[PDB]
From a paper:
The evolutionary arms race between prokaryotes and phages gave rise to phage anti-[name] (Acr) proteins that act as a counter defence against [name]-Cas systems by inhibiting the effector complex. Here, we used a combination of bulk biochemical experiments, X-ray crystallography and single-molecule techniques to explore the inhibitory activity of [name] and [name] proteins against the type I-F [name]-Cas system from [name] (Aa). The biochemical analysis revealed that both [name] and [name] interact with the Aa-Cascade complex and interfere with the DNA target recognition; however, [name] binding to Aa-Cascade also stimulated non-specific DNA binding. The cryo-EM structures of Pa- and Pp-[name] bound to the Pa-Cascade complex indicate that two [name] molecules bind to the thumbs of Cas7f.4 and Cas7f.6 subunits and the two [name] binding sites are similar.
We solved the crystal structure of Aa1-[name] protein at 2.3 Å resolution. The positively charged surface can be observed within the structure of the Aa1-[name] protein. Mutational analysis of this surface proved that it is the binding site for the non-specific DNA. The M1, M2, and M3 mutations disrupted the [name]-mediated binding to non-specific DNA as the smeared DNA bands disappeared in EMSAs with target and non-target DNA. The M4 and M5 mutations of Aa1-[name] permitted the Cascade binding to the target sequence leading to unhindered R-loop formation and the Cas2/3-mediated cleavage. The deletion of the L3-4 loop (M6) or its replacement with the Pa-[name] loop (M7) completely blocked the Aa1-[name] interaction with the Cascade. However, the stability of these mutants was substantially lower than WT or other Aa1-[name] mutants.
Residue numbers in the entry: 2 to 77
Amino acid sequence: TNVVYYFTETNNINAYATAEALKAQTLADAKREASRRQCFQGTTLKIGTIYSLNSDGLLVDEITSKEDGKKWVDRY
């Protein structure tokens, strides 16, 4: 399948990690899948596209993020 969205689960919004591919094809599905793939309490979720990644595969330019217990906040 083709990959549109990626996510990371980090300890806070200023920490970076290698992007993991999502199966979702829309943003609303990506948010639901990313919340369901979150392992831990208290972590931060970021979602981005292929253009959100640097050359090392790190998710640095997320299009939306979600602090634990809060709603998704889009960049714009």
